[PDB]
Ligand binder design. Structure first.
Ligand SMILES: Nc1nc(=O)c2ncn([C@@H]3O[C@@H]4COP(=O)(O)O[C@H]5[C@@H](O)[C@H](n6cnc7c(N)ncnc76)O[C@@H]5COP(=O)(O)O[C@@H]3[C@@H]4O)c2[nH]1
Ligand SMILES: Nc1nc(=O)c2ncn([C@@H]3O[C@@H]4COP(=O)(O)O[C@H]5[C@@H](O)[C@H](n6cnc7c(N)ncnc76)O[C@@H]5COP(=O)(O)O[C@@H]3[C@@H]4O)c2[nH]1
Ligand SMILES: CC1(C)C(=O)N(Cc2c(F)cccc2Cl)c2cc(C(=O)NCc3c(F)cc(F)cc3F)ccc21
Ligand SMILES: CC1(C)C(=O)N(Cc2c(F)cccc2Cl)c2cc(C(=O)NCc3c(F)cc(F)cc3F)ccc21
Lengths: 324, 319, 319, 324
């Protein structure tokens, strides 16, 4: 399960396969109840699968017509890769196509046209589906494909955040805090990152909640990156107020990628909607949590805070997590 | 068409529509040639569409059985939103379902056919007969912007370029007055191989550090005194300083390479290259439409086949 | 049974044979109960075996068509070796093939049956119907030692332990005479989580460096003056030095973790844990049978559930 | 292809699938030629596949009988994981089993016993195969599975060599060579590793070939590893002799994992044969080449030498590679 926030979706499971198994069992029971020639059941099932395979072949050919224009750039200028991407596994698909053709051209069929007439009708139906866009994928299927294939912006944002910022500072954060304390308050030993699922992320944190105010600045860290010599990473130690008293101080910061998502939502070229913004923010939080859990650099040296504004007091949540 | 590099794919067009039109024309021609009664053809076609619609309904039912668990988390506890996301539009889908059922029952067993169709759909779901080809996945991702490079490019624009391009001219003027005439453009390298070495000098001995710029300071994401820096490098030729300009390596390419190396990312090298190309293309587009950019930044893209980065940078510098 | 840790799998036994015996007994019982003529049962069984043999022959033929390309590289250009590696034993396999063909032709079409069997075998090869379950793969790998942990464990024994254990007593005696009474055993930590932090102190604040040992020198693999070192750490308890011993982290565990992180390795976390357990088990076995080891090394294995490494090490130290 | 040595096997391709496709086409052509009731072809094909699926079920049950003893340790003490590992994808396999049972119990069959009698005979055959070991995997299939699944010792040895030795020294090798040259011969700028496929690997390199003799020693490198503080990595600069003249000098070393493989071959508990030694050595060379090709640390800073003794002069090969 997920511990950051009850509103964070867990990874999709295998409920669809369970429902499919139940449906198959029910269909088999129904066919048994009907008590008609069983051979016909298998024959027509095979014919239907063959028709679907031929339709997939036609759709793949139509898609390949477009994909060929991009052979040189996208597909390394090789026709074999183009065919593989348009039709999948060439050999498996070819074997299935040959079986479908043979069975349909050979097996007697009472429901369905002969081979040539059936092929014409199938091509007609596939062309109509392509032209009218009648063949579309539901949002749930698209989301499942994206998550399974990791085709979501949040994945890239989280990996960028881990590889560009955390992976560098986190090992040296203990040393920097030690130096700051030895030279001078009694700050915590972990980095606290706030993850507003609403992606508000005000630039001036004190504006978000008066109870949090700036205290001091950690020593800067310098490192060479992307040709930019002496690139500087800096933190900011804040002080948390309870009834006007300094309850605790921590190295606190927000997640810039949430600002990026919010800005993308504001713009129009991005094609980014607010609902997509929320979904990608939740996915970003989940992915970052997983990466830090599996990461070696972060060994109880960083903590993440996730909250959703509904009455609301950021300072109270931060203090609650600190006192643990 | 993109002028950055010939190896940059262009946005997908409508060749599929043209192929569909050709297929439809040929299909109508052959249907005319066969000479069978039109009524039988219409019956067969409408029944085929009805069967497809019922299969889609069953697939949506299974997806609903799956998504009811995450109703609260992802769909905000609203059943109607879940149904919409699973089966599509409830209204149109239900109307098509009723029409399909009526046509199936009216036109000439019945229950056995429905059971067989459900069994076939279940087999498709379980064994994955009706998978999605990589081309279709790529088209869907590009159309819906369900890519990785899109987010990285917009992060780069909104975190770095949008916050230093306006002040880059002022910084360069300050450096020039304080002092080696550097150009007034930011040159960003876009290696499609996603190498991105930590130092230009190692990448090309013909390039070396010249001097930094006045660091820019700004508050960002609860971090005080966030500092953006740069590094004027000197471009050489035959040992003589040919020119100087601000040089950059697109860090998101570093991120893509690191994701490729790591197993937990689920990122392959082919995906790395494709997403790098997509990042370059979308960055070019956004900068072309950017208001902040007023021809104060130049995008340089190159691929290692031998290559001389200094020569390419100088060539872009002369123009 | 392995005494290192309860979470260490024991070598696979012969439960499959017992299950097969029970199944055979039940099958004979039901065959007796059915009462059908024995001759028909024999015919059916022998024809089934013949069909299986022909399927294996066809699979071997396809594998031969595949391996003829690598005949020169892997099989030294010998066709007979390739055939043996593909179809198994040519002599026995050919004899069984002839027997199967004769029985198929003699006992009561014929060519159609052979074509159908070939088609079924081709479908199995293409769509992968007859895949190998993970348990069978693991059993084959363990029986044939086609594992990763085996090589790492033997490398550790043959590169480090076999070259320092004989001289460890001398090194410890030299350190003691030069000077904090360190024990005369090498304590190797075996974290099944494959963490292996670079420093013990970070792993456990209750452990800190005490002193090095006299470096051992030897020539290895064309490298002169290869140096093996150690580091006596001090074990604490309530702030007082409870004991001292030479402490080690099994580097092969570091290698397994790194392989898990990297994508190019094709290594998953479950495989990482299983191979770590296998490495610990095989290391225990080889040391138990090692001539060089004369109870001068102790293997400590632990798993993080809270855990106090210092307490576990001290517990193993008292005994 | 492979460039280290023509005797290095390339990764296995998809020739088996091509042969299977050809076989399927030939079988379909034969069935067409026979011209008997096509329905029977499909019916008996389905029956045969169902029988195979039931046999796989029985074999998986027999294997599970043993695997259950290891549930707590190997399989995290969960029965579901045990069943998954014994039978594969539980839902897919269950659906196939249900289809097989239904079709066999329903479809009329002229060749083959009724459902119960057939099940008895199938269990008998599977039990006989298990008891007698008649069901075995050919060496080629085992090698393909191992390479595809990366279940070979050479994989681990190569990854250990890269992660423990190369990944550390290679970035600092240029600096060490620069310091050695500035303080004092004109050594090369790359590390040369020798990979004897025969795994001879003499400890004293000068013994291998007189023309190679020791010259000097590079500065030592120190780093903390596995709790061993100040662990030392050292190299050895040699001088290559042509006609008694110092043709060239290089930072040369052998691959210790080849020594490990040779020693494992010598022992008996290892269960390691000489042919397996050769195969794993070649696989180690190939894997290390791939890793270094994809590795960022090695940027034309290391070179590998592969040779096979058949007349033979190591110095000549090393010089030939150096002068490139
Ligand atoms: N709080 C905070 N303090 C920092 O010093 C810092 N440096 C990076 N980050 C954030 O971690 C992630 C890793 O950065 P990346 O290298 O991938 O690309 C960066 C980088 O290419 C560029 N950039 C941002 N800050 C600098 C900088 N100081 N110097 C050069 N380039 C910079 O613009 C991209 C995106 O910046 P942000 O989207 O605002 O947040 C980044 C980023 O999300 C920081 N976050
Ligand atoms: N030529 C050479 N010079 C070195 O300094 C060196 N250090 C390692 N290696 C080789 O690279 C690989 C990486 O070593 P790993 O850490 O995985 O396990 C090592 C390590 O756990 C241990 N070991 C070997 N040398 C030392 C050492 N000097 N200190 C501590 N442990 C050592 O024994 C294991 C295998 O040693 P080798 O099988 O002889 O060759 C190694 C290894 O194949 C070296 N090779
Ligand atoms: C599962 C079952 C029994 C079923 O419900 N249908 C729906 C259906 C029709 F689609 C067509 C007529 C009746 C029914 Cl009832 C079906 C179809 C076939 C088949 O052979 N389809 C080829 C095919 C067509 F039939 C028409 C077409 F325009 C193109 C095309 F390619 C096999 C089994 C079934
Ligand atoms: C491809 C084709 C036509 C074929 O060549 N055989 C070989 C064969 C026999 F195996 C058995 C008899 C004749 C032939 Cl000819 C076959 C078998 C079946 C079948 O139903 N097998 C179940 C089954 C058995 F038959 C016997 C048994 F001991 C156990 C068992 F589980 C279906 C199709 C075929």
């Amino acid at each position: 399960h997920s511990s950051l926030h009850p509103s964070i979706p867990c990874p999709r499971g295998h409920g669809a396969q369970k429902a499919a198994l139940v449906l198959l069992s029910a269909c088999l029971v129904t066919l048994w109840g009907l008590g008609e020639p069983p051979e016909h059941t298998l024959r027509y099932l095979v014919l239907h699968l063959a028709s679907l395979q031929l339709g997939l072949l036609l759709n793949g050919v139509c898609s390949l017509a477009e994909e060929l224009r991009h052979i040189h750039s996208r597909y390394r200028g090789s026709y074999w890769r183009t065919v593989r991407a348009c039709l999948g596994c060439p050999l498996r698909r070819g074997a299935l196509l040959l079986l479908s053709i043979y069975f349909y051209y050979s097996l007697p069929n009472a429901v369905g046209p002969p081979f040539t007439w059936m092929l014409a009708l199938l091509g007609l139906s596939q062309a109509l589906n392509i032209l009218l866009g009648l063949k579309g994928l539901a949002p749930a299927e698209i989301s499942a494909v994206c998550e399974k294939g990791n085709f979501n912006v949040a994945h890239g944002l989280a990996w960028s955040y881990y590889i560009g910022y955390l992976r560098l500072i986190l090992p040296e954060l203990q040393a920097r805090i030690r130096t700051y304390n030895q030279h001078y308050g009694a700050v915590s030993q972990r980095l606290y990152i706030l993850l507003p699922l609403d992606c508000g992320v005000p630039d001036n944190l004190s504006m978000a909640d008066p109870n949090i105010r700036f205290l001091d600045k950690l020593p800067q860290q310098t490192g060479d990156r992307a040709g930019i010599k002496d690139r500087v990473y800096s933190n900011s130690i804040y002080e948390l107020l309870e009834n006007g008293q300094r309850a605790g101080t921590c190295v606190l910061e927000y997640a810039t990628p949430l600002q990026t998502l919010f800005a993308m939502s504001q713009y129009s070229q991005a094609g980014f909607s607010r609902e997509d913004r929320l979904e990608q923010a939740k996915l970003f939080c989940r992915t970052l949590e997983d990466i830090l859990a599996d990461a070696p650099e972060s060994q109880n040296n960083c903590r993440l805070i996730a909250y959703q504004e509904p009455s609301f007091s950021l300072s109270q949540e931060v203090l609650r997590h600190l006192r643990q």
